[PDB]
Every structure is written in C-alpha cells, then in structure tokens.
Amino acid sequence: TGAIEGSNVNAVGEMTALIDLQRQFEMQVKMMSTAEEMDKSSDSLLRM
Amino acid sequence: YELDYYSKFGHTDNYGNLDLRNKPYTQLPSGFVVKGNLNISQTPIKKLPKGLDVGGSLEATNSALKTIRSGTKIKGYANLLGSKIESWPRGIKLGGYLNLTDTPLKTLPAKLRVKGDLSVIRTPISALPEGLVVDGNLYIGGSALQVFPDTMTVKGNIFLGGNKITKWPSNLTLGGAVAP
Amino acid sequence: MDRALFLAMSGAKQNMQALQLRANNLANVSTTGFRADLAQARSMQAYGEGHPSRVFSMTERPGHNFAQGSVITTGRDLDVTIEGSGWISVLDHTGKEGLT
Amino acid sequence: MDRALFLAMSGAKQNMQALQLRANNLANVSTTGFRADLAQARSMQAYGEG
Amino acid sequence: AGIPGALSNQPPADASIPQDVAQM
Amino acid sequence: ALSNQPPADASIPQDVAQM
Amino acid sequence: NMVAGIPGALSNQPPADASIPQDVA
Amino acid sequence: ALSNQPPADASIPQDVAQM
Amino acid sequence: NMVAGIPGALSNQPPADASIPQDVAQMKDGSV
Amino acid sequence: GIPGALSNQPPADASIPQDVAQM
Amino acid sequence: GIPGALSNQPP
Amino acid sequence: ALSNQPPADASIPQDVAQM
Amino acid sequence: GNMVAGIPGALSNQPPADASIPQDVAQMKDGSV
Amino acid sequence: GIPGALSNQPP
Amino acid sequence: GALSNQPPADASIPQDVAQM
Amino acid sequence: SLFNVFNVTGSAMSAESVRLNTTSSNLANADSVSSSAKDTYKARHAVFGAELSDTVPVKVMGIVESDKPLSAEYNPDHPLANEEGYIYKPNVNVMEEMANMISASRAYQTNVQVADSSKQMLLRTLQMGQ
Amino acid sequence: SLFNVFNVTGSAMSAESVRLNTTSSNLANADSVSSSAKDTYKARHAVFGAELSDTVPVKVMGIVESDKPLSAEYNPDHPLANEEGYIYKPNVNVMEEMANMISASRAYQTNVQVADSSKQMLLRTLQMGQ
Amino acid sequence: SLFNVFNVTGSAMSAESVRLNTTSSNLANADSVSSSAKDTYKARHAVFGAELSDTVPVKVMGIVESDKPLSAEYNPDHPLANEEGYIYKPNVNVMEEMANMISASRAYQTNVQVADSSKQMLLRTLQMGQ
Amino acid sequence: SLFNVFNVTGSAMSAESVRLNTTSSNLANADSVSSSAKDTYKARHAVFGAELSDTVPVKVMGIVESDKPLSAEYNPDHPLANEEGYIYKPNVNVMEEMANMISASRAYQTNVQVADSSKQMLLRTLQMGQ
Amino acid sequence: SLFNVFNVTGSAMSAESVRLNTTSSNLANADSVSSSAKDTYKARHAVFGAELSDTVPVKVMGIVESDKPLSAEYNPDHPLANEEGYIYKPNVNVMEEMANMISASRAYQTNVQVADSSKQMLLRTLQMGQ
Amino acid sequence: MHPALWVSKTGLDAQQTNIATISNNLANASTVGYKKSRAVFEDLFYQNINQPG
Amino acid sequence: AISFDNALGIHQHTVGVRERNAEVISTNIAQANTPGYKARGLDFAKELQAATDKLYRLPTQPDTGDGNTVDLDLERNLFMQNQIRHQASLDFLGSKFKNLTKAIKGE
C-alpha cells in the first residue's frame, strides 16, 4: 500500500526487435523485386 | 448540464466568438451576450435563451435547435441548416441572411423582412407569408410551396428549383430573374 | 507469377504486424499495471504435392511479460501495488469479471 | 510545383521577421525609457474559387 | 451529402448564402 | 471542370472589411 | 461447376489470416 | 507429368494437430 | 492582351508584403 | 534417393494415438 | 518596357 | 536571333568609370 | 590561323580582377595569334 | 606554341 | 590518331630527376 | 471458332484490367475516413471465375469487399469521431496492394504475348500450300 | 479500363495535395493570435471521401475545422486580452501535422507507381497489332 | 504541330535558367555593400510574360529589382557610413531565394520531360502508314 | 535436335524456381522460434542432380535442411524456454541467402537466353532451302 | 558529312579528358611542398583552341600553370624554409577544382550523346530509298 | 496511414498531456492551498485482426 | 460511296485534336510560374463538332497572389493520357490505309 505498479515494458528489448523487423522486412521486399525481375525476363520466350 | 461563466471562457476565441461544436450543453443563461459569432452546431440545445444577443452570426448547422424566442438580436446572419426548427418567431432583428434549408419549418412570420438571402429548400412549408420582402436571392427548390401570396418583394433572383408555381403574386417587382 | 512474390509479401505483411505489436508496448510505457505483449513468428509449411520448399511465416502473441512492474511511491492511501505475482478482480462495464 | 512550398516559405520568412523584433527587444534591455515591442502573427486566408 | 461542417472559401459577406459548399 | 470565362484571382487581404 | 475466388495477395496467404469472406472462399 | 486425378489443394495448417 | 509579372517567391506572397514593385503588379491584370 | 530429404506431408507425431500407431 | 527595368549596359 | 556581327564580350569591371 | 584560346572552366569564368589566367594566355581570347 | 606552355620532357 | 612507325617510349616517373 | 485464343486472352485482359482498377481505388481510398462506421470504405477485390462445363474463359463475377476488420484509430478531435474518440479507417493493406499491382501488370502483359503470338499462327495458316 | 486508373490515381494525387496544403497552413498558423476575418484560426482537416458514383475515385468533400478547444494563455497586458486577461491561440497540434505530412507524402508517391504501372500495360496493349 | 511544343518547352527552360542565374547573383551578393556602379545592389527578379491571345511561349521581358528597403546596419566606424553611422545592405531574403532555387530547378526538369515526350509523338507520326 | 535444349533449359529454369522459393522461405522464417507441428525451422536447400551416363537435364531430387546448429538465444522469461532459459532459432544465414537470391535469378535469366537463342536456330532450319 | 561530327565530338572527348587529368594532378599536389624537378608545383591548366575561319575541332594546345602567387606558410623549423622562415606551397584552390571536375565530366558526357545521335542519323541515311 | 504510425502518435499525444500536467504543478509550487495533479495512462482498445469477427 | 471520308472514319481528325491538346498542356506547364496566366483547357467535343473551344480551367485550390491557375499534378497526368491516346489514334488511322492498300492490291 502507498505505491503504484508501472509497466514492465523493456524499452531496449522493443528497440532491438524493431531493428531486426526492419531488416527482415527489407530483405523480403528485395525478394519481391527479384521475383518480378525474373518474370519480366522470362517473357521473351513467347516473343517470336 | 448547462454552460457556466467559466465554461463559456474556454470556448471563446481572441475576438469573442463562442464555439460549442459537439459540446454537451443543453441550455444557455438568459440575457446571453456574445461579442462575435455564435456556433451551436451539433449541440443538444433545443431552446435559445430569452434576451439572447449575438454580436456576430449564429451557426446551428445540423444541430438539435428547435425553439428561438422573440427579442433575440443577431448582428450577422442566421444559419439553421439541418436543425429541428419548426417555426420562426416574430420580431427577430436579423442583420443578415436566413438559411432554413432541410428544416421541419412550417410557418413564417407575416411580412417578414430578410436583409439577405432566404432559403426554404426541401422544407415542408406550405405557403409563404403575405407581404414577404427579400433583399437577396430566394431559393424554394425542393420545397412544398406551390402558391405565392398576393404581394411579395424579392430584390434578387427567384429560384424555383423544381417546384411548380401556379398562382403568382399580383403585385411583384423583381430586380433579377426567375429560374426553374 | 512465381508464388515467391506472395511468399515474400506474406512475410513482409506479417513483419509490419509484429512492428505494430511492439509499437503498442512503447506507446504504453507509462501505463499503470501494463503487461508487455510478446511477439514471435511461426513457420507453417504448405503441405501438398511437389517439393517441400514453400513455408509461410505468420506472427502471433505467445504470451505476455508477467514480471513485476516499476513501483511508484506516491504516499497515497488509495494506491496499492501487488507484491510479486497476483491480480485484482474487477468487473468492467459489461459486468464481466476480469483480472487487473 | 505545389504551392505549399511557398505557403511554408511565407511562414518561415515571417518567423525570421518576428525573430528580428525579439532581437531588438533584448538589445534594448539596458536602454533608458524603452517600451518593449510585442510581436504577433495574423492569419490571412486566400479567398477565391476552390 | 457528406461532412456537416465544411468551410467556405468565399470572403464573409453575411448577406449571401455561400454556394461553394454543398449547402444541402 | 471548364468554363467560358477566366476564373477570378485570389484575395489575400490583411483586413477583410476592406476588399 | 465453377472455380471462383479472389485472385492476388488476398488468397495467396494462409487461411489463418482470414481476409477472404467465408462465402467467397 | 500428366495425371487423371486433379492435384490436391495445399493445406498450410496453422497447427498440424488440428486436422 | 499580355499578362506578366515576377514569378516564384515574391509573387507567391500576400499583397501586404510589398516585395513586388507597384507597376509590375499592375501588369498582372491585362495590358495592350 | 537422397538421404535426409524432407517430406511434403504433415509430420506423423505423438499426441492422437492415431499417428503414433499407424505406420 | 516593363516599367523601370534594369539595363544591361554600363550606366 | 541570328545576327551577322559577332557578339561583343561581356565586361565585369571593378569600377564602371575605368571601363 | 585565326584562333581563339584560353583556359576553360573555372579559371576564366571568374571576373578579370582575380588575375588567375596568365596575361599572355588571357589575350588570346579576342582572336589574336 | 603557347608562350607559357609546359614541356613534357625532364627540365 | 598520329600513327608513327616506331613504338613510343615508356613514361619515366623519377623521385628525383637528377637520378635519371 | 476461328479465334478461340483471342476470346480467352482478351477475357484475361478485361479481367486483369478490373483488378488493377480495384487496386487503384483501394490505394486512393486508404485514408478516406468518410462518415459513420458502416459507410466507411472497405478494400474491394474482384472475383475471377472459370466455368469448365477446348478453352475456358475467365469471367469476373463481381466485386467483393474484404472481410478484414476496419483499422481503428483514437482521435477525439476529428468531428466525425464517435463516443470513445475513434475513427474507423478502411482495411486497406499497402503491402498486399503493391503485390496485386505487380501480379496484375505482369499477368496482363503475359496474355498480350499469347494473343499476339496467336495471330502469327493464324497468319501462317493462311500461307499453307503457298 | 486502364485509363480509368489515371482518373482514379490522378484524383488521389490532387487529394493528397489538398491535405498537404491544409497541413502547411496549420504549421504556419500554430502561433497566430490574430487573424483577418475576426476568427482565431482553428486547425483545419481535409476529410477524404469515396465517391462511389470497380473504379472508386477519392474526392475532397470540404475542409473541416478541429473540435479541440483553443489554447488559452494568460497575457493580461496584450491588446487582445479579455477582461480575465487570457488570449487564445489556435489548437494546432504539431505532432499530428508532422504525421499528416509523412502520410500525405507516402500516399502521394504510391499513387505515382499505380499510374506508372497502368501506363506500361497500355503501351504493351498498343504493341499488339503492330 | 508538336514542333511548336519544342518552342514552348524550349522557351520555358530559357526562362527558368534566367531565374536561376538571378538567384545565383542574389546569393552571391547578399552581403555586398559596395558595387561597380555606385548604387547598392538590390535583389533582382526576372519578369516572365505570356502573349496569350494554341501555343503561348513564356518570355523574359526584363529584370526588375525588389522595392523593399535596403537593410541598414549601424557601423559607425565603417568608411562608407552616413552621417548617423548606418551602412546599407541588399534586401536579399535567404528563405525566398532557396525556394526560387528549388522552384527553378523543378520547373526546368519538368519541361525536359514534356520535350522528350513530345519528341516520341513526332517520331511515332513518322511511322504512320509505313 | 534443338528441342532437347528446350527440355534442358526448362528443367534448369524449374530448378532455379525451386531454389528461389527455398530462399524465400528461409528469409521469411529466419526469425521463427515456433513451427507448424513440433519442429523448429531449419534452413532448407534444394538438391540439384545430373544423371550423366547429347544433353543431361538437371533435376531437383528433394529438399535437405542445413546441418548448421540452431542459434541458441537466452530468453529465460519466454514461454518456450528450456531448463536453462535458452530458446532456439533457425540457422538461416542472411549473407548466403542473399547470394542464393542473386545467383538463382541470374542463372534463371541466362537459361531463358539460351532457349530464346535455340528457338531462333530451329526457325532458321525451317527456312533452309527456300 | 556527319562523319565530321565524329571528328568534333571525339576531339572534345580527348580535350575534356586532359582537363580531368589536369584536375587530378592539381588535387593530388595541393599539399606537396617538394618536387623532383626542383620547382614547386603550380596549378596546371589546359588551353582549349578553336581554329574558326562547318566543323571546328577543339584541340588542346598545351598545359599552362596558374598565375596566382604561391601560398606561403610560416614553418621556421622546416628543412626547406628560407631566411624569413616561410615555405611555399602550390596555389591550388579547392573550389575551382570541384567546378572543373563537375564541368569536365558533364562536358565529356554531353559529347557522347551527340556522337551517339550523329551515329543514328548516318544509319538512317543508309536506309534511304529502300 | 499505416496503423503503427498512429499507435505511436497516441503515445506522443499522451506524453504531451503529461508534460503539460507536470508543467502546471511546478508552476503552482508556491500557491497556497494547491493540490497536485497526476496524469493516469491506460491502454486503448485491443482488436482481433486475423479474425473476421 | 467508297470515299476517303468514309474509309478513314473520324480517325483522320482525332490525330489533329490530340496534337492541339498536347500543345495546350505544354503551354500550361510552361506558364505555370508566370503570374496572371489562366490555365487553358480544350473541349474534345468542340473539335469533334468542328470535324463533323479553348476554355478556362477552374482551380480546385486558391491562388497564392500570382493568379496562376495551373496545377502541375493535373497537367502531367493529362499530358500522359493524351500522348497514350495519340499513339492509339495513329495506330487506328495507320491501319485504315494498310487495309485499304491490301484490298486494292490483293496482296
């Protein structure tokens, strides 16, 4: 009694999770870009 | 509840305009004076206080306003768009236009003078009062009006908007044109 | 076109969801009696005919950080904090009992 | 291009002018019988079509 | 119609109803 | 939309009472 | 007999996402 | 490779035990 | 008629800021 | 065939005797 | 002719 | 504006008097 | 042999008061030599 | 040549 | 360019031109 | 009869065109709060169909709104908010709209090649015996 | 058609431009006690709306002012001070304008990609027949 | 006549290049008290013009100085000081010159796009019929 | 018979597509401590094979997980932590997966070039003699 | 004679390359106090020429040192110092070298476009009449 | 707007009101018979995303 | 019948209108910075009637003291659309003669 319990959020734990989520997000975006790049190249097969 | 003197101060701008938008106020004190414009849009206010004075324009668009008592002084215009006003009291000193669009208005004071434009668009009003004088543009589009009184005065344009007028005033001097 | 566009899109979409989950914890640093939400990823393989090469990843909330929060001393009689592990029984506006 | 470039420039330009008025106030702290100058911003809208 | 509290770009005149906004 | 007459300019007065 | 469904990204993710309406799926 | 039976649809289960 | 004036920063100002010369502002209406 | 190759079928597991028993 | 234009010749 | 006489070189003096 | 000459770029485009170009080279700009 | 021209041979 | 009938020599980059 | 491939490839061109129009509307209305909470814009998606009763044309069977819950935002300042100061926003996900844009454009142009190459086969058929 | 994408995406380009200009006027009037028009400027917001009237363009239906009360500050010696001595300043919130500035720019640029994506599809559709 | 377009875009680029050089001379002379001609430098601004009456080229009709007063500085010991010790400096405003630099560059680059796009239309017309 | 080249390049393109999807799953599941049934994800790798005894097609013969140990992390408060407070995560290495993304894409595109070039050679054989 | 253009643009390619290598020697020897030829380095510069009298090639007629005085530095204990204690350093100015690097590189590339465009006009000339 | 932008903005708005509340308390540090005010934070609504309802 | 007016349809006039439209958009972009210039729009149906005008564009936003009513976002989109449609008109009108020549020559 006479005290209030705050939150247990570990600020560093969230920040290091953020930077890893950013890098993994960006790497998958590159996978999307190289997927359409391959698709565009494999379109001259029907380009007689 | 009701607006107090201290609550009034927290809704006033530098030049003295009271802003009550979306605020939960039900009634204003009698003899109320506003330095500038008054805005009671979207308010649960159903009645305006007696002796109300507005130094600017009254804004009550899409509000629950229903009754305005006589003796109210408004320097600017009156905008009661989308409110619940059913009748207009006699003796209102209006320094501007009167916009009553989309209101359940049914009756108007006899020989009413509008120093600006007048709107009865999409209103269930059945007939205009005798001796009506309008110094601006009159819009009756979408309303239930179909017969004009014997004498009326419009100093601007008259817009029918779609309603059919069959009995035109005997004495009418128009400063503008008539549009369907 | 190659189904790797959607395999990577589904991972990028989930990474945003985990980012939002972590964002709520940082927005709730000062909240009283707030248990931080845990975020992780689960691998769910696309079983079927063909070579097992396509596995999806979706984020989930496995649990919460039930550690003791930072106690603030206010010197107020009507302020209490739970020592160690515990909860306080409260009913919300729906009259439904819930631990706080 | 977009007119928000000049709309913000017309605001940043006035902030420098307001800064000049405050600079004259602090330069005149030791001056004798000096009446401080107040600085305020007026909001003016471009009325027209749109 | 739509939004109930849209503004009007015309200068204040207090005599003419602004038709810039969707006044319905 | 289009119109058959030029649109008017924009007024930026320091006092709306004087326009 | 028909084979209908939303094409694109809304169907190429695990059903646990639950974006497609049940009736359409 | 061609077959007479239509290929089966993929599952992608959230939890394998639930099935 | 010919219409003209200073472009850019000076014209994209309220008239109170008298950066634009008076005669150049006249040209911004019409001329012949 | 290659040794250690993964299979494209759910992995027979423990709970639900059904898998632990049926080959 | 822009009234009061600068010139391009030594004053 | 094609002329027949080569344009003269611009001058950037310190003083317009000694020009 | 009526040529025009000079140092291109930054040196020449400074005003003449800078005196960066040699006077001999700077005088081959009017068509001399 | 150029009066102030530099030589490409050792001095 | 200016085609010659004898191969051009290699440039010499001495640290001191006296020792050349 | 003489142009069966054109009717199928052309149907795909019309089908994939609708999916791009739907994607454009979803991205242009990703921040349109509008009014109320049920008139709020929701991400729309076309439904492709194939009736296999030779060639099976692709027919769009109408636009269907997404079932994703609306994105709630706390903002007790917008006049179109609610009792708890929440404005509900369209359930448009940018990442899935970008993927649809890539998928629609590439698939649309793939059918252009098939339709263009189909005409060449028809032109070569006219040269039989010549 | 693919040309409808240009109308839909182009409308969003104008829509996000309106919100950018509104934010610019909010940032420039966050500290303006006085104002022509006898009104203490209040924060303005552009409320987007889908004009359904497949292809759903976005339209600005009008600019709406903020509902937050004006920030009252006790400045008794100011000429605009009331009897109590408080001058009132606009309710512009800096953080939301910066967030609006980011969102408006991000949404504006992603509408350019859709217009670019539809442009390529039309060019390939024209190469058919050549 | 798309060749008239090249004149309009070409005249536009010339107009924007004049404004950039005017901006360059303003930045270089924002702190110059003296001058070759015995008169303090005033901020310069090229005047664009339109002969509207099809294609209306934009023409520069001359450079016009800003009429704002020269910024006086209290420098009593300066050799050029007046009877009260004030030296006068150009009225160049840094913020407005940076906007002109941004505006002149962007307006220059967008006219290149129009000229390049109009060039493709003329080449495509040469292929008509043939 | 250049039609064999089509089989070989087609089999190579199929193999590269399998490798690309394997790389896509590794990048998406490089941070997943959980799994569908009961076993932590391990970096997968397709196995190419050449059945040399003309042309030798390349065939994928199954997916094999990497033998690198799982990266143990100290997350003692995690629900899935073991007796020592360690949780295990997939052994996906970013650098080698990025190289696979580059290598598979460049290998995929060069096989299209061979098939396209081989397609032309068959056409010129048809036109031989006339 | 569009082949004469190749003699003009190509000459500018060499001329702008000499000015770039001249810039590099000035950048690298801006702090060099000694020399192998016993004379302190001075900022070298190329001389362009135009034998105007159709196509006028640009030829470098020799490299010329700058006329600026050497930058003196008070280093009384340096081995190469004079009686007054000063050592002399090359008169290389950083700002003008950067402008030369920007101007020469852009001038080099703008002659590639003319040489490339003049190539196309010759190829179409061969195609005339057929 | 991506939802993560607005979720973070709520924290910025919440802390902004906290600073204003603290600033008033320190302003009235010598006011006779004044009672300090504290700002109370609570989490907002939690929404199921991967479920239709 | 059998006349060029009927063989070419209206595709002979559309190419000209798309050129005029491109000129006007080019004028609007160039005159975007010049104050007092009012953006000019071309009505397609008017040149359709002229085959079988030069209006003003009402701004969506107020000016900033220039009086210039050119929106560069709108002009770029309208120039892109006109250029794409102009190429299609060339394709339509170009194939009119290609079919016409094949009918006459029979080859």
Q: Which chains touch A (3 or more CB pairs under 8 A)?
A: C, P, S
Tell me whether residue U5 is exposed, middle or buried, using C-beta atoms within 10 angstroms of its C-beta: 0 to 12, 13 to 18, 19 or more: middle
User: Chain R contacts of L15, Cβ < 8 Å?
Assistant: 36
Residues in I closer than 8 angstroms to K3, CB to CB, are: 23-24
Distance in angstroms (rounded) separating the CA atoms of residues S88 and D14: 59
Q: Which of P77, Q84, E4 is nearest to B8 (CA)?
A: Q84
Measured between alpha carbons, how far is P116 from U41 in angstroms, rounded to an integer? 64
Q: Helices V11-30 and V44-51, interaxial angle, to 10°? A: 140
Tokens standing for residue V93? 């009108």
Using the beta-carbon criterion (under 8 Å), do P99 and C1 form an inter-chain contact? no
- List the structure tokens of C50: 């063909």
S37 and A37 Cβ atoms separated by less than 8 Å: no
Q: Are Q117 and P20 in contact (CB under 8 A)?
A: yes
Question: Which residues have C-beta within 8 Å of that of residue Q120, sequence separation ≥ 6?
Answer: P105, P109
Angle at V30 between CA V27 and CA V35, to 5 degrees: 100
Distance (Å, rounded) from C-alpha R99 to C-alpha D1? 11
Query: Six-digit token pair at I29?
Result: 């209406």
Helices (H) and strands (E) in chain I, counts: 1, 1
Considering only residues 1 to 11 of chain N, which have any Cβ-Cβ distance to chain T shorter than 8 Å? Answer: 1-2, 4-6, 10-11
Query: How far is residue P73's CA from residue U45's CA, in Å, rounded to a whole number?
Result: 9
D49 contacts on F by Cβ (under 8 Å): 7-8
Sequence letter at residue G22: Q
Q: Is the dihedral of CA J2, J8, J12, J15 positive or negative?
A: positive
Q: Tell me how far apart the alpha carbons of residues P78 and Q93 are, in angstroms, rounded to a whole number.
A: 12
Cα distances from S33 to residues B77, S90, S98, S129, in angstroms, run 68, 7, 21, 66
Tokens (6 digits) for B108: 């108007």
Measure the CA–CA gap between G8 and R67, rounded to whole angstroms: 62
Q: Are C33 and S50 in contact (CB under 8 A)?
A: no
Q: Are B96 and B77 in contact (CB under 8 A)?
A: yes
Q: From CA P109, how far away is CA Q2, in angstroms rounded?
A: 13
Decide: residue U29, CB within 10 A, 0-12 exposed, 13-18 middle, 19+ buried.
exposed
Beta partners for residue B31, in sequence order: none
Q: How many CB atoms lie within 10 A of CB S90?
A: 24
List P65's β-bridge partners, or say none: P44
Measure in Å the smallest separation between the Cα of M22 and chain L Cα atoms. 18
Q: What is the DSSP string of P21-90?
A: HHHHHHHHTTT---SSSSSS---EEEEEEEB------EEEEEEEE--SPPEEEE-TTSTT--TTSEEEE-
Take residue V41 and report the two structure tokens written for it: 């729009």
Minimum-distance CB partner of T19 among M8, M22, M25: M8
Q29 SS3 class: coil
Calculate the alpha carbon distances from Q120 to E18, F5, R85 in Å. 44, 37, 67
> How far apart (Å, rounded) are the C-alpha atoms in residues S98 and A30?
9
Structure tokens at C4: 């790797």
Question: Which residues does chain Q have within 8 Å of residue E5's beta carbon, measured at their own beta carbons?
Answer: 64-65
C32 to A3, A7, S25, U41: CA distances (angstroms) = 11, 6, 40, 6
Q: How far is C43 from chain A (nearest CA, A)?
A: 15
Distances (CA, A) of R4 to R116, R121, S89, V50: 13, 13, 66, 22
Strands (E), chain B: 18-19, 33-34, 38-39, 53-54, 58-59, 73-74, 78-79, 93-94, 98-99, 113-114, 118-119, 132-134, 138-139, 152-154, 158-159, 178-179
**The pairing of beta strand B58-59 with beta strand B38-39:** parallel
Across the interface, whether the CB atoms of J11 and H16 are under 8 A apart is answered yes
**Which neighbouring-strand residues pair with P60?**
P48
Our measurement of the distance from residue Q92's CA atom to the centroid of its chain's CA atoms, rounded to an integer in Å, reads 14
Q124 CB within 8 Å of a chain F CB? no
Q: What's the one-letter identity of residue I28?
A: K
**Alpha-carbon gap, residue R32 to T108, rounded angstroms:** 36
Q: How far apart are CA B118 and CA B133, in angstroms?
A: 10
Tokens of U6: 């607005």
d(CA B142, CA S98): 68
Q: What is the three-class DSSP state of Q63?
A: strand
Q: For helices R94-126 and V72-105, give the axis angle rounded to 10 degrees.
A: 10
Tokens coding B146: 């179909």
Q104 in Cβ contact with Q19 (< 8 Å): yes
Nearest CB partner across the interface for A28, out of S28, S109, S119: S28
Number of other residues whose CB lies within 10 A of the CB of residue V80: 20
Q: Are E and P touching by the rule of 3+ CB pairs within 8 Å?
A: yes
Q: Which residues are bridge partners to R59 per DSSP?
A: R49
Task: Please name the amino acid found at residue R112.
Answer: V
* Cα separations in angstroms, T13 against C29, N9, T26, T119: 63, 25, 20, 16
Interface of I with D (CB under 8 A): 8-9, 12-14, 16-17
Among R23, R33, R98, R115, smallest CA distance to R71 is for R33
Q: How far is I12 from chain V (nearest CA, A)?
A: 5
For residues P49 and R120, give the distance between their C-alpha atoms in angstroms, rounded to a whole number.
40
Nearest to B56 by CA among B32, B31, B73, B80: B73
Torsion T27-T33-T37-T38 (CA) sign: positive
Question: Cβ distance Q49 to Q58 under 8 Å?
Answer: yes
CA atoms within 13 A of residue E9's CA, in its CB half-sphere: 21
Report resolution (Å) to 1 decimal: 3.0
Q: What is the dihedral of CA V12, V13, V14, V17, to 10 degrees?
A: 140
Residue pair B115/B132 in contact (Cβ under 8 Å)? The answer is no
Contact L9 M16 (CB under 8 A): no
Q: Which residues of S41-80 are buried (b: 16+ CB within 10 A; e: fewer)?
A: bbbbbbbeeeeeeeeebbebebbbbeeeebeeeebeebee
Supply the DSSP symbol for S119: H
Contact: P103, C12; criterion CB under 8 Å: no
Using CA coordinates, name the residue in chain G closest to C55. G14
Report CA-CA distances (Å) from B153 to B123, B129, B161, P60. Answer: 20, 11, 19, 60
CA C53/CA C46 separation, integer angstroms: 8
For V50, half-sphere exposure in the C-beta direction (CA atoms, 13 angstrom radius) is 13
